[model samples]
Target: QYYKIDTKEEILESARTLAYDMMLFYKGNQSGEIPGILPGPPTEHKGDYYWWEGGAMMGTYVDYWHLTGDPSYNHVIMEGMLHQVGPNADYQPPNHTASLGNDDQGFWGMSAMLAAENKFPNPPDDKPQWLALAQAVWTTQASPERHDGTCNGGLRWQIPPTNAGYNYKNTIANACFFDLGARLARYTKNNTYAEWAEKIFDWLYAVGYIDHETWAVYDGGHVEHNCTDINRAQFSYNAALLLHGAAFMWNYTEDQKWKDRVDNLLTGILRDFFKDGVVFEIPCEGRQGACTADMLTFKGYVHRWMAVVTQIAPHTKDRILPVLRTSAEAAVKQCVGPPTGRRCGFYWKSGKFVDPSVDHTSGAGEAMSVLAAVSSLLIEYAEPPATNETGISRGDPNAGMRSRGAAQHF
Candidate 1:
């Protein structure tokens, strides 16, 4: 109803409008804020955004460009991402340490990986290359310091001991590392990356974040219980991340197990998140106001992941397409914010723009999530995610090492 999604022209036009509205929150290129950052919704705190969302915004931009063939925001993405790469080429910009985590760094790294795969415009020769930036993120997380004996091996939820989640090991960081490594393996043709990805997945399973038989992925565990205490709270992106990583693995290895893993994960994802052909955040979507900035955007990533799986797996198009289109249809109606008639909302089931300006935090996330879900309709027109054989992004094996010693990671 918002637009004719079946037609490419209308879908693209809809995406352009959503993207335009999404950037309303971006000030990274402007004089007021730091370069390469979009503020999180100021729901709890005023004028604040976290590190991961910045990576998320750029990553969303990369998908926008790839899907719609619109390069208008490409420069904004390049400047913001490069600026946050910090002096070390890794994404640990010094000021970001307070909120920094492996998951945060991995978000930027994965964004860079996508940029490379899409052959998005490369940075200046002297600046960090997209592939290298991703590689650096993988390399840094591969550290003995972070990937230690805790919980029998996993990246902590937070990098610094001072941070609250230091004792917790969540699925996002490990999943991001695995996802990043899987893409790197495909892009760089490195067995090391693939093997590391395997190890991370192995650790994830052994630790029980992933339910073995059902393949239902859960949030994470706490070091306080020697990692035995698992929080069953499920978020869409946690499953989405592992599903994506599994898809990449299946594509990379062509192994039956990986294929089965992808299939099972897809089954779980569809059942858990996409009931009635619409996507919703399961754990936090209650009428009670419980969604946070992090939870607000998980559904969008699930939408994006669904499209990518169809590409890498190829056989999944039939099942994925209907749900994807149906969700997009519902999602568009929620973009009915008043005044400009362009503002978006968090809950799409409401069938109207929920006015993201108030309890919604006026952050870019609602726009980003909706944009990701709606723009995904264009996947049929785009190429499958690029591989080493087909991609144009360059790589440097040593890209992030320069900053390893110079900068202290969170």
Candidate 2:
């Protein structure tokens, strides 16, 4: 019998399959996991480093739970994170030093921790020692490193510089700095994190890293004393971060300028990136050689911004939803098929996109997967008062609900 589904359960089922496939891949199982589900290392042809991939999985799993009311998804994600947080864990301990050096580790780890905490708040009772470790890391890892004299404050994602002369400071790095601050802002109920978050946004804008005119992430900073030249002016990930941070600022400040800036960036994405119901791999640059190379950046970062902007930006549905629906459909189509078959994904090398040669491409997949999950969540949390993809009105009193307002969004 060909059955038509009418509820969000179908959508969550798809996401759940992706979620478990990622988890099983990380667990090194063949029968337990399906094919094309992002296997081996998560570095996109770099080297084995599955932390961020795991982080993305964490987010997707959380979103799945949010959609399905199924604790199993939460269990899968929490178990995965706890394994890493434990003393016998494979990844580095979630410590202040760990937080200070690797921005990916600190920022991504904080994202995972916060997701888990949101789903399972009981902490020691509902979870394990790893949750405690997550708490500690979130508490101390992002050290109070002062930014450059220009007030370009952010957490360094590389090995701490020998001195300020040779420190790494890039847009995404600072964007992560803002993400960390936003999370801490929620956790501490202190405006300091939010304040620093605003500073980071302004700094990025001031440096032209977050602006549409020259927005991009580069591999060089303190090490090479360069700007967006080596990497070029195209970064989908931090642009989302920038948008999310700016949206948060608008909520706090209620300033129209921030909204106008968001409008411009949204226009930039539409004008420069969109084509035939899909956004190019990089919004600013077309299918140029260097742009399409890092396909994961498009999925992970670009989709992230779209997801958030769909919720935060005041664009008309005619303008925004179609772009999101079409682009997400187009992008996800490349990687995965219906649940009956193996899923597909992409990896990166030398800023180029390709399939994984080994375990290194997992991070790329994870990055994309995590943000894709966030995008899915935006649909659930950000959509209007109408019924959900599940056909259930948000008015359900028993349906676990949170405000779709700015405070709850990220």
Please tell me which predicted candidate would have the highest TM-score against the true structure.
1
Please give, for residues 345-392, the per-residue lDDT of candidate 2 as tens digits: 342112223333332343345434533642363464433211112222
Tens digit of per-residue lDDT, candidate 1, span 292-319: 7777778888888889988998888898
| 163: Cα error in model 2, Å | 13
lDDT of 1 at 34: 73
- Scored by lDDT, model 1 comes in at 0.83
Score candidate 2 by TM-score against the native.
Answer: 0.66
- Per-residue error for 209 in candidate 1, Å, reads 0.6
Which pairs of residues collide in model 1?
36-80, 159-410
Query: How many pairs of residues in model 1 come into backbone collision?
Result: 2
Worst 10 residues of 2 by lDDT: 392-401
